[PDB]
UniProtKB/Swiss-Prot annotation:
This protein's name: Extracellular exo-alpha-L-arabinofuranosidase
Annotated gene: abfB
Cellular component per GO, a single term: extracellular region
Localization, UniProt: Secreted
Pathway of action: Glycan degradation; xylan degradation
Biological process according to GO: L-arabinose metabolic process; xylan catabolic process
Source organism: Streptomyces coelicolor (strain ATCC BAA-471 / A3(2) / M145)
């Protein structure tokens, strides 16, 4: 009853799933789990001037995302990562920008945008040759170690680790540079998952293609191991204009595979793979920060 990841990906897509509430021009950078049988989605927001964050009211079907309440967080958690940390029975929301490069907060109730604890440092390091600094963290643990992965808008992917028993905690300043390519090839939006039923981990990285944003995939047998390109070109992407089946967007950008198990292992089921992504009208132009990004969901066609 186990499935493998395909070598070539083909998706079908929803249309735009929701419009930003009054005061925002974009919904972005989604992170999602299933919580009590419902979709639980955090994201960045943009007013065009600054980024903030929000959580949607829980909803059972993606087709009902359009009517879900949009609940602003009073303290911004830009480009968030949401998961349940089972060893301490606590929810974790990690994010960028504030007192430290990466930050996290904890909660016993992840549906509440303002029930999160005081911010704690997640990462305090700095990288070279980046206009942004550390960007788009994710967190993932195996049975032994908690890993931090992140990007730098500069062609590099970075990794840090600690024994799981030391988490929640600060990774500190140290990191490993694990991948290095052109800025376009390894840009941002990095995510890492355990492939359920396989001795395999899946990494996806957002790249800048000729036709728009797309994702390149890599696999590893271990979270500390080397990453092998999988579907890693614009013509044969993990997800992009070439294979999304989306008509409303030519961009497949920063989001999260749908995680049915909300825990720190970031486990995905290759038999029912879905991708909650951000896209935008091909006609939308202007300053990056003002782009009208919207949620969509891809469903893998097997
Ligand atoms: O609490 C306070 C903090 O909030 C504060 O955080 C700072 C907030 O501003 C941050 O600057 C942003 C860095 O990230 C950028 O997003 C990039 C922009 O570039 C995009 O890529 C471009 C797309 O178009 C192409 O043509 C072009 O070639 C690409 O480069 C990319 O997709 C985005 O992710 C934002 O635009 C910046 O506003 C800053 O880093 C934070 O430090 O700090 C103080 C603290 O007290
Ligand atoms: Ca993310
Ligand atoms: Cl490491």
């Amino acid at each position: 009853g186990t499935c493998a990841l395909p070598s070539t990906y083909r998706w079908s897509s929803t249309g735009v799933l929701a419009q930003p509430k009054s005061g925002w021009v974009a919904l972005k950078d989604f992170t999602t789990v299933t919580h009590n049988g419902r979709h639980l989605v955090y994201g960045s927001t943009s007013s065009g001037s600054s980024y903030g964050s929000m959580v949607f009211s829980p909803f059972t079907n993606w087709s009902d995302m359009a009517s879900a309440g949009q609940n602003a967080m009073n303290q911004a958690a830009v480009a968030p990562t949401l998961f349940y940390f089972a060893p301490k029975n606590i929810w974790v929301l990690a994010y960028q920008w504030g007192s430290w490069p990466f930050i996290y907060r904890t909660s016993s109730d992840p549906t509440d945008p303002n029930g999160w604890s005081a911010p704690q440092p997640l990462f305090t390091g700095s990288i070279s040759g980046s206009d942004t600094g550390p960007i788009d963290q994710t967190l993932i643990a195996d049975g032994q170690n908690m890993y931090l992965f992140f990007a730098g808008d500069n062609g590099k992917i970075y990794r840090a680790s600690m024994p799981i028993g030391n988490f929640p905690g600060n990774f500190g300043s140290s990191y490993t540079t694990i991948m290095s390519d052109t800025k376009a090839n390894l840009f941002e939006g990095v995510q890492v998952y355990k492939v359920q039923g396989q001795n395999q981990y899946l990494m996806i990285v957002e790249a800048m293609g000729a036709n728009g944003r797309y994702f390149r995939s890599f696999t590893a047998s271990s979270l500390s191991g080397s990453w092998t390109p999988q579907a890693a070109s614009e013509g044969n992407p993990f997800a992009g204009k070439a294979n999304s089946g989306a008509t409303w967007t030519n961009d497949i950008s920063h989001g999260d595979l749908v995680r049915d198990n909300p825990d720190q292992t970031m486990t995905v089921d290759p038999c029912n793979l879905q991708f909650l992504y951000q896209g935008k009208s091909p006609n939308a132009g202007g300053d990056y920060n003002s782009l009208p990004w919207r949620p969509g969901v891809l469903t893998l066609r097997r």
